[PDB]
Design a protein around this ligand. Structure first.
Ligand SMILES: [Ca+2]
Ligand SMILES: [Ca+2]
Ligand SMILES: [Ca+2]
Ligand SMILES: [Ca+2]
Ligand SMILES: [Ca+2]
Ligand SMILES: [Ca+2]
Ligand SMILES: [Ca+2]
Lengths: 58, 51, 51
């Protein structure tokens, strides 16, 4: 999660953010930006919304 | 001026430690032994402890 | 020949540190304080400090 030494390095999107609670922060240092962190994080509280293909006609 | 160099006595290693004693960890859950019925031993959870 | 044990003088713990001095770390970001007119207090983000 956010243990000691652990976060004395760099995050890994398989190591931490999946099998762990992946609160955020460590979910954000892997990219260090805004482009992918939001979308990526949105799918772990309850899942991804574009799985269902809700919108019509592209 | 004159060096009587013959190393040092270090048959033992030295070792620091974690200010509080144990460094990492790993949450855990109490599981009281709600044993099986007849044959196979089943399990359950307990509410006496923490979570 | 004769073991003359008095214990050792240790009333202060001796601590070691991080090669850099400051422990962990966590990103942070500067803010300012546009007045909270008629109300509480705003809280924006100044641009002078790299974020
Ligand atoms: Ca990290
Ligand atoms: Ca995995
Ligand atoms: Ca990790
Ligand atoms: Ca882990
Ligand atoms: Ca991390
Ligand atoms: Ca960090
Ligand atoms: Ca941060």
């Amino acid at each position: 999660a956010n243990s000691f030494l652990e976060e004395m390095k760099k995050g890994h999107l398989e190591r931490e953010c999946m099998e762990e609670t992946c609160s955020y922060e460590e979910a954000r240092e892997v990219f260090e930006d805004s482009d992918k962190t939001n979308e990526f994080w949105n799918k772990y509280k309850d899942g991804d919304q574009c799985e269902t293909s809700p919108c019509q006609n592209q | 001026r004159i060096i009587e160099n013959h190393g040092t006595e270090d048959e033992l290693p030295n070792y620091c430690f974690p200010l509080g004693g144990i460094g990492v960890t790993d949450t855990y859950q109490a599981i009281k032994a709600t044993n099986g019925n007849g044959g196979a031993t089943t399990w359950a959870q307990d509410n006496t402890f923490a979570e």
